[PDB]
Structure formats: C-alpha cells, structure tokens
C-alpha cells in the first residue's frame, strides 16, 4: 500500500543562528510529493537515511534495531526504549529471527558490550524521526505535534530540531522495527531554499528543480521573477555503453621459470630475460603471502591487471647483509653506486 | 563495439568518450594513431580488424529559460543553446540557428522586437508565447520631387535628462 508524502520532513541543517535571510543549502532532504511505503514487520534497506514516522494512540512501538548482519558477526545498534530510561548500547548482540520483547528478549548472550548512554525519554500525537549517519555520527532529529481527526500526513510545514549526536561510527545497512503503522521514506540529495524569519525558526521553503519556473526562482533568491532571459543550468549527455577491446592472444608468460630458477646470478653479473607475446596474470603474485615486502612505484598494484605494456624485463640477483633497502630510485651507497643503479624515472616495483 | 553513440571506449588501455564512425583517412602502414593539436585522440586504428574509427565528442550545451513576467502567465519556453532538436515542456519544437527552441509557436508576421534571443529572432501575445523575426521600424517614403519644399510652421520645446557617473 502507498500514500503520498506531503510537505513534511524538513530539518535544521547546521545549528547556526541566522536572521532575516534567504539561505540556499544542499543536503539530504525528503522530496516533496514522494510516496513513502505504508505498513500495517519485514526488514527494510537503510541506504542513505530514513524518514521514519509513526502515529498511534498508545505506546505500542517501543524500539528499533540497526545493524549489518544482525548475527554477532558485525557491530549493531540496538537503540531500545522503555517507559522512562532510554538505553543505547552499540555492541555485537546476537538477535533472534523475530524479536518481540513483560520479559526480555533478542538481546541475550551479549559476549561483551562497548557503549552505553542515558537520556530522557523519547515517546493524538504524531512522532517524526530522522536517522542519518555522517562521518561517524548517528544523528536523530524529532518533533512531536498534536494531530487531529485525520488519517494521513497532516498537511502543512514544520521543521525538526536535533536531539542527540552519538559518536558510534559503524555502518548500519539494514533496519527492522519492533513491537502498528508506519511511513517509511528515503532521503535523496536535493537543494532547498530556506527562509529564516528573524529569531531563526524556518518559516518557508521552495523546492528547486521541481519545474522550469521553480529553478529560476531559486537562482534569483526571490519569490517574483522579472521579465527577461535567465541561464539556469547545463545539459550534458551521459554515455550509454562501454566497449572493451583487446589483442587476440592466449599464450601464458613463464613466471614460474624466473621466480623458481635453480640458481640465480650474482649481483655483479645479473641476468636479464625478456618476456613477450603472452598473458600475464599478476593476481596470484599479489595475493601470494610468500613475499616479505611488495612495494610498487609508478603503478598501483591492484590496477596493474588491467593496464598493458609493450615489454617487461625481470632482473634477478641476490644481495646479502645490510643495504638491501638501497634498491630504490635516487638512492646512494656502495650497492647503488658500484653494483646496480636504477634510473631516475623508473616505473615498476621491486620484490624481495 | 557499438557505433554512432556516445560510448566510453577502451582500446588497449586508451580510454575516452565519443561517437565512433567510419573514416576515409588513409593511414600508412606504419602509423597506428593520430592526435589533435591538443594532447587527445582525433582518430584511432582498431585492433583485430585493422580499421580507422573517428572519434567526435558527444554534444553538450547550456540551458536558458525564457519567461514573460509575473504580470501575465506561468507559461515559459526553454532554449537549448547550440544543440540540435534530434536529441533530447514538450509542446512544440522549433529549430533555430541559436539552438533548439521548445515551447514557442512560430508566427509568420513580424513585430517590433521585445525579448532578444539571438541571430535576429526575438520573442507574450494572443494567449501564447510567440517567436518571430524582428521588425526594424515603420516603413515610410518621402514625397520627393524636383520642385517642392516643405517648411515648418510651428514648434515645441522638450526637456531631456542625461545621467553620468
């Protein structure tokens, strides 16, 4: 079932006082006239933010669960509520398949727990919440308002104040509700023109990009637009498909014949074998744990599998004792000066 | 490979975006790719099949909004500068040398220019937005003859204002 999300869902973006000014700001807001899913529960995606809202007559909804796998495998938010002590404990609790906590539930067998915080309690009354996660901060905004004999979103405009800025720093990837109607919506990045009257308490807003007339209005920061020609945006065509073309060749390079040679040459008379006309799969060498160090210069080690080169030479020699670090561009010492000297613009990697 | 569309291609590590079309530039056997005056590819030789593909950047341009004014109507026209109408409010489409104009109806009779658009075309009247070729002023002729002179019999005094910073 669906209903139409009205002009609801605007909140204070920055905690900065401003007065008598029209300020244009970009953040994640709920688009006007969006639908929002109506439920009468299953697990829903969290993506980039949720406009959770619910109406009721009593305190039937008592909590929320946030996490990634909800199986003690990752850290999971368990913000839960009770009559007078709201408790937040972000720990790897192992939750049941269908939690429904007069006794206690789903938060049993908590091996160890890392965070606890206490606040004053949250919950004919409409209760709006906004949950966003920005750079390691779980932010909740809320407002309570007297609803009347209406069976939907009550029409009109009201801004939401901040309540907590808990420093949890986890992902959160999926969500579920606890125990019966809700309005789940999703936020998207859109630009709004916000009107502050004089004490700073947002009095109006204009949703840009709604239509051609609305775009001119935001650009001029005015509610009336004079006669003329205005430049408002830039058109850019996006590509439709990718095409990958490569030379026809299936030969494999003898990497086993260089790294596993019976006897290596001395550093004063190092060997230089030329490898060509083959397919070189470098993912095994990258993942192989047998190497002590793997420092690549010039190219990053994980994109070297896509790029192509005309020829590669593998110079193999043995060095013992100190100075092993001297094999690098622009280095000095007995080894670099008399034994093996690398060019200044060398592009490649040394493995030892 | 798909031709005649803006695509993001990758030829042996050479990447870019453009429309790939047939060409008649006779590359000699020893050259593989040609470059512009700028350090970017102008054409390229395909592998496996050894053919010459031309690369032309896909079309782009600015968007301008034409509006009559808060005293008349909420209907507006949108001008896509320097783009053709053969690619994307959706009522009428008129192709001009200034770009592709959408939303304005073309009327054959000329009037004095009001809102300039460019390239000689100006553009509310008769319940709709109209576009037309601008008039240069009223046409009149003087009754020239080899033996007639006109002398004024009266005068008027006028006052003008000139403002300079």
């Amino acid at each position, epitope marked *: 079932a669906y209903t*139409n999300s009205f*002009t609801r869902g*605007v909140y204070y973006p920055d905690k900065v006082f401003r007065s*008598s000014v029209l300020h244009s700001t970009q953040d994640l807001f709920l688009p*006007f*006239f969006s639908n929002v899913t109506w439920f009468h529960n299953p697990v829903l995606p969290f993506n980039d933010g949720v406009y959770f809202a619910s109406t009721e007559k009593s305190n039937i909804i008592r909590g929320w669960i946030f996490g990634t796998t909800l199986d003690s495998k990752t850290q999971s938010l368990l913000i839960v509520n009770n009559a007078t002590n709201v408790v937040i404990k972000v720990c790897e609790f192992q939750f049941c398949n269908d939690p429904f906590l007069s006794e206690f539930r789903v938060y049993s067998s908590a091996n160890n727990c890392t965070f606890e915080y206490v606040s004053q309690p949250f919950l004919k009354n409409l209760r709006e919440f906004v949950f966003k996660n920005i750079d390691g901060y779980f932010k909740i905004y809320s407002k309570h*308002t*007297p609803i*009347n*004999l*209406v069976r939907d979103l*009550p*029409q*009109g*405009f009201s801004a939401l104040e901040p309540l907590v800025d808990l420093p949890i720093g986890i992902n959160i990837t999926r969500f579920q509700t606890l125990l019966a109607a809700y309005y789940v919506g999703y936020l998207q990045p859109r630009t709004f023109l916000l*009107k502050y*009257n004089e004490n700073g308490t947002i*009095t*109006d*807003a*204009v*949703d840009c990009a*709604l*239509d051609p*007339l*609305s775009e001119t*209005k935001c650009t001029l920061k005015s*509610f*009336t*637009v*004079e006669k003329g020609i205005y430049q408002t945006s830039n058109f850019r065509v996006q590509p439709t498909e990718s095409i990958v073309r490569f030379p026809n060749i299936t030969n494999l390079c003898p990497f086993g014949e260089v790294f596993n040679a019976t006897r290596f040459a001395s550093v004063y008379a190092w060997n230089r074998k030329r490898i060509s006309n083959c397919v070189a799969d470098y993912s095994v060498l990258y993942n192989s744990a047998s190497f002590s160090t793997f420092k690549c210069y010039g190219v990053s080690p994980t994109k070297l599998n896509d790029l192509c080169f005309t020829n590669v030479y593998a110079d193999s020699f043995v060095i013992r004792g100190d100075e092993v670090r001297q094999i690098a561009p622009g280095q000095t010492g007995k080894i670099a000066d008399y034994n093996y000297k690398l060019p200044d613009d060398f592009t490649g990697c040394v493995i030892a | 490979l798909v031709k005649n569309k803006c695509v993001n291609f990758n030829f042996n590590g050479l990447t870019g975006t453009g429309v790939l079309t047939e060409s008649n530039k006779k590359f000699l056997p020893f050259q593989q790719f040609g470059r512009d005056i700028a350090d970017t590819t102008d054409a390229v030789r395909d592998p496996q099949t050894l053919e010459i593909l031309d690369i032309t950047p896909c079309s782009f341009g600015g968007v301008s909004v034409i509006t009559p*004014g*808060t*005293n*008349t*109507s*909420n*209907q507006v026209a949108v001008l896509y500068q320097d783009v053709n109408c053969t690619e994307v*409010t959706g009522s009428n489409v008129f192709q001009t040398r200034a770009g592709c104009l959408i939303g304005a109806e073309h009327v054959n009779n000329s009037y004095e220019c009001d809102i300039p658009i460019g390239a000689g075309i100006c553009a509310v009247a008769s*319940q709709s937005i109209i576009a037309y070729t601008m008039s240069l002023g009223a046409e009149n002729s003087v009754a020239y003859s080899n033996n007639s002179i006109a002398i004024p019999t009266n005068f008027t005094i006028s006052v003008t204002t000139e403002i300079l910073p």
Partner: antibody
Amino acid sequence: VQLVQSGAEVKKPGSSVKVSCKTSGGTFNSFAINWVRQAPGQGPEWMGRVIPVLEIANYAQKFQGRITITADKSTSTAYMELSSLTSEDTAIYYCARHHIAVAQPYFDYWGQGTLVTVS
Amino acid sequence: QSVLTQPPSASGTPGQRVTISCSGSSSNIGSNTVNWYQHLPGTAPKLLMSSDDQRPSGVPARFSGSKSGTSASLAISGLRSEDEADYYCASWDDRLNGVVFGGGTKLTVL
C-alpha cells in the same frame, strides 16, 4: 493566464448545483485550484483543493461528505457540485490558483466569481 | 465566526500614514505566515503581501508589512484616493487543517 467561470445560476432548495472553472493550458500539472466563497455580510471561507496531476483532494472538516471536487485533463476544466442546498448556501463562489513548490499557500490570481441564489 | 479578529472600521486623512492590525492566536499566527489581499467589489482581489515580509513584483514601494508575536500590521505611506478598498488577512491553521480568513476592514479616506 485567466480563469473563466460559468454564468449565474438560480436553484431551488433541496436541489444540486454544478459550477465549473475553465483555465488555460499550462495551468494544470504544477498548479493547484482552490475554492473560496463569501456569504453576504460574512467573511470568506475556504472549502478544498485538488491537484490535477495527482488526482488527490482535500476537504474542509465542516463539509462532511457534501462536497466533491473533480477535474479532467482532456478538456482542461474543473468541476464543483454541492448537494443538499439550503438557504444559507447563497454566496459568491471564486476559483483561485496556487503554485505547488511553496510550503505555505499564497493565492496569486483570482477569478471573477459567480453568484448563486437560492429561494 | 472568523478566527482572526480585525477592527470593523478604520479611517485616515489624505497625505498621512495609517496602520491596520490583524490579531489571532498562537496556533495560526504564531506559527505561520500571513498574507494581505486588496478587494474591490465587482472585481477580483489582488495579492499585496506574501510571506509576511516579502513584497510581490507589481505593487510599488509604499505598502510595508510587519509581524510580531501573535499580531501583524500593515503600513501605508503616501496615502491616496485609490487606496479605498477592503483588506483581508489570512493564515494557515494547524488545528483546523485549513486556511482561515479575517473579518475584513473598511478603510475610509476623508
């Protein structure tokens, strides 16, 4: 643009009356239509509105299932019909338009109005 | 009855200034904007004042608005004969879930 309403109507109590308000071409989609009356010796009162592109309607709480507002896209005309006409329903009816990308309503252009008399 | 209360009558002398007021409650005026409409009988009304501090495109520099607490006012300078009309104040009401209009005032120029 302009809004053109139907002519004056004379009706008997207990009957039904239908009043239309025809608009321009672009005045649908991103525009709402509001209905306002003014009883003699009284202040103006709001009834409801309809968004043609969304076909969703709102009604004043005092009009409990007596008013229904509909609109069609093919002809570009909006309709109002009221049931159970009584003596106190005599007034002048207006249709006025709103811009949809503004949170707080503000009527911009008003129609000329029509007069309905009951006796 | 109109939720917003306005003085039934008001008068002013030519050439001077006059002030009109519109008083309401905390549920409508205190939380939402106000709008001012000019009405002449036999004709359609017009928008004088929008978002309670923002002037429209057409009206010239003279009409000014202000809002304070639960009361709002409109100021007219350079009063002239054609200003004879009715004035209405309107605002959204949260409790009634609809728009509520004022009672209207007759302004008389002596």
